[PDB]
Design a protein around this ligand. Structure first.
Ligand SMILES: NCCC[C@H](N)CC(=O)NCCC[C@H](N)CC(=O)NCCC[C@H](N)CC(=O)N[C@@H]1[C@H](O)[C@@H](OC(N)=O)[C@@H](CO)O[C@H]1NC1=N[C@@H]2C(=O)NC[C@@H](O)[C@H]2N1
Ligand SMILES: NCCC[C@H](N)CC(=O)NCCC[C@H](N)CC(=O)NCCC[C@H](N)CC(=O)N[C@@H]1[C@H](O)[C@@H](OC(N)=O)[C@@H](CO)O[C@H]1NC1=N[C@@H]2C(=O)NC[C@@H](O)[C@H]2N1
Lengths: 130, 122
RNA sequence: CACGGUGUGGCCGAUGACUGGGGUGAAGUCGUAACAAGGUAGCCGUAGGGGAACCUGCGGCUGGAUC
RNA sequence: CAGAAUAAGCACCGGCUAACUCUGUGCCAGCAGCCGCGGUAAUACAGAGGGUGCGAGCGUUAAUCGGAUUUACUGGGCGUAAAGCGUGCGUAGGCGGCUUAUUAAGUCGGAUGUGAAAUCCCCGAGCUUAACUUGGGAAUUGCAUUCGAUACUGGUGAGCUAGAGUAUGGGAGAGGAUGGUAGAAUUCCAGGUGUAGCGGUGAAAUGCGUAGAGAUCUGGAGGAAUACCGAUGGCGAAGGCAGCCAUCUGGCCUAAUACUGACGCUGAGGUACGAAAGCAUGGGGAGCAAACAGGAUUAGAUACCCUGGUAGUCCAUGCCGUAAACGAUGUCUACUAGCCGUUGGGGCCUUUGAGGCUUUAGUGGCGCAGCUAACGCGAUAAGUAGACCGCCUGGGGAGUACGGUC
RNA sequence: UAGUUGGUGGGGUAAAGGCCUACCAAGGCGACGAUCUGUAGCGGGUCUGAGAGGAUGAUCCGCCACACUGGGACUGAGACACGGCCCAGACUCCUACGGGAGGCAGCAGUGGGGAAUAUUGGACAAUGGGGGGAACCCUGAUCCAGCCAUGCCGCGUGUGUGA
């Protein structure tokens, strides 16, 4: 059965980018919305929309391409239900020497690894993006 | 293997076995020559190799190779044996130290004398 | 209560007339089972038979050539 | 104070690996960490000359970690190289849909106490230098208490319907169990016609036949299996399931409403089923046929071929638990170009009846991207990801021995 | 697993406590591995490794345990006491056969084992320890010396010229 919806979202994004889609849609949740907002702020995607027709809600992401290649070259789930990963402020991972971003869930919200370092807090490492 | 499988059962490590069990982790061993004889090598080698059967202080009964040209060993000699394989004589895993206890140093040598135990000629 | 004794059992090691299979060496003897459709396609399970590779029955596979 | 006066060896030179020739010997003597040298021009054996590396040391043996991503947490694999249990169900456990309030266990941050000295590291100091000694730091990645944060995970309360399940209509099927029945054919028996062969092989022979065979026609007995349909078709968890009819019975597909409201996925132990052969008790026995007998072939034939033929193959009730039990590919979930078939349904469109578009659940052929050592796989993945389980660690010895369970 | 798990009365100890005892109850531990069995002193540290890990626990420091093999207690603030006592066991020694004696895993040393590891040395001058008012006495702790290329570091075995 489906037990990791965050990994499902990342996999949908990766497959859509590999298939050169312009738009990718999925069932929505607040966690996926926060992750998509972080990606949009960092510039990996263009637009984030949420359509709430009924009790069901659909999340839509607009993808970006640049010089014939997708902007997101690597997206990797790090913490998983079978093995959760938590790091302190001094052990936050760096993605290819700072040219990437590690998405971190902290007690002050979802933010990037450098933002978490600036705020001096740790948390759960959700994904690596580059 | 999944993380849960690793937690339930770890990673096993296979212990190694010594190639010189008769030494019993010692650098050398004393022994008494039970037999002094000659054997033939395996293919593609052909020669007449000088071997002894030695009873060690460890309790084992092994075979050792005599190196160099010319040896004075006979049955009931007291010798010192170290590790070392010949690789052309099956079942021979040890060497006899020339010039230690009853083994004499090889004569007429002037190169590589420390092996074969030949003192420096004047 | 320590040590000791008696009876009866369990476990560990050593040793033993004789006996079974295994490996290595060397090519002495009998055959030619497999590799080509290997000259009866091969192999798997099982059962019976035979100096020996092996043979035959029943079911299965293609990891079988040619039509 | 006197005088160069008292003071230099060890390993190696085929490649890995810096350093090459000559004599002696001729698979001998010997060398060897691995690959390998030696059988008359040996840079690989022994000596010599020369050189190379170290140097009061130089080599060998033993031992630990490394190289070894060669147990892979960091950081590996299982179609064919070793590796998916034969297949299901399910216990403990692991993991688990969306919204919201709360809690602060996991998680994160601060403060305080502690984490002996020595040791490691840094800056100095004293040894004629260095080893060594020593001052001060840094470090001791940890533990405990207490105060905070609430994104995620967990707990609790409430709510929801996209997962899962229930009721009602309709449909396809060799799905399973029991009983009955029909037609073709083989064998045997009796009879009619009728007379010298029949059968078998590469060729023969064993065998059958003048007390009459084989052939042909009529009538009886019995057992086993279901031609054509028949299909890259169908059904079943797998093993497997084919004439027709009735009875009992499981699953699946399909439409729209209504209903419950996460009731789910996987699954160590466990348990159920599980081809063929085999075993036990009692029946049955046409055909076929291990064992066996005879005839051939052959140097021999124990076999392949031929004539016979017992167990068995069949039924009832139980056991056994193994197969190249194979897609050599564990189960569940989501996503990722297209083209052409076929099976069971739903919808729409033409216009009178047969076609054309779609959609869904199976079953096939190609093939973009991606993957792979290659072969190849490619929406029925061996692609992209997640959850759980099983398994592998050079070839033999060996799925073997001892012990144990059945 | 049957003082076994808990409770009550009593005993006992410097002190909590099944530590002991008499009753009452049926409890307690175990797949997060009880019971049984093999091996093993533990740590600060040491070696290796980029790290994570792996191996190791000489010399220095902390803790524990043992003192020929087992069982006890006495004295004392403190021991169930290496060079104290009692009992049992094995072994060794003297004897005039009456009777006695002993425990190097302290330092040195002997025999044996092994591939292999040293002197039957000096002084209490220094730092400590015991006794004493002190003088001072004792101290194989210690400080030194002897032996070994075992390791690390340093130095020498000559320098210039000379075809
Ligand atoms: N989701 C669940 C669905 C379950 C269902 N199973 C569907 C499924 O999942 N299928 C997966 C496909 C895997 C397939 N089994 C592998 C394969 O096909 N060969 C194995 C690989 C061997 C080799 N690398 C290729 C090879 O030699 N090929 C031959 C070849 O082309 C040709 O032979 C000759 N002489 O020219 C042909 C004619 O016979 O035979 C093929 N060989 C075969 N053809 C058969 C076939 O397809 N199947 C059964 C078996 O018989 C197969 N062997
Ligand atoms: N009580 C002590 C027991 C010690 C131990 N439990 C048993 C033991 O050692 N028994 C021996 C034994 O009886 C015997 O010797 C042999 N060899 O048989 C005897 C010869 O006289 O000596 C005894 N030993 C002795 N040691 C003692 C010692 O030195 N002085 C006094 C006296 O007691 C001596 N006896």
């Amino acid at each position: 059965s489906m037990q990791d919806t965050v990994a499902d979202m990342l996999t949908r994004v990766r497959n859509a980018q590999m298939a050169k889609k312009q738009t990718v849609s999925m069932p929505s949740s607040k966690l996926k919305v926060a992750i998509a907002n972080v990606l949009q702020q960092e510039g990996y995607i263009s637009n984030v929309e949420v359509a709430q027709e009924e009790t069901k809600s659909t999340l839509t992401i607009t993808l970006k391409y640049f010089e014939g290649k997708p902007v997101i070259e690597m997206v990797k789930r790090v913490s998983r239900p079978g093995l959760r990963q938590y790091r302190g402020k001094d052990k936050l991972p760096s993605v290819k020497q700072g040219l990437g971003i590690a998405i971190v869930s902290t007690s002050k919200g979802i933010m990037t690894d450098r933002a978490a370092r600036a705020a001096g807090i740790g948390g759960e490492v959700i994904a690596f993006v580059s | 293997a999944t993380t849960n499988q690793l937690i339930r059962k770890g990673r096993t490590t296979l212990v190694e076995k010594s190639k010189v069990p008769a030494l019993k982790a010692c650098p050398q061993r004393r022994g008494v020559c039970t037999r002094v004889y000659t054997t033939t090598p395996k293919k593609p080698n052909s020669a007449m190799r000088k071997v002894c059967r030695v009873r060690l202080t460890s309790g084992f009964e092994v075979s050792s190779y005599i190196g160099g040209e010319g040896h004075n060993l006979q049955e009931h000699s007291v010798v010192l044996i170290r590790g070392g394989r010949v690789k052309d004589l099956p079942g021979v895993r040890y060497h006899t130290v020339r010039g230690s206890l009853d083994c004499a140093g090889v004569k007429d040598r002037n190169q590589s004398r420390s092996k074969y135990g030949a003192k420096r000629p004047k």
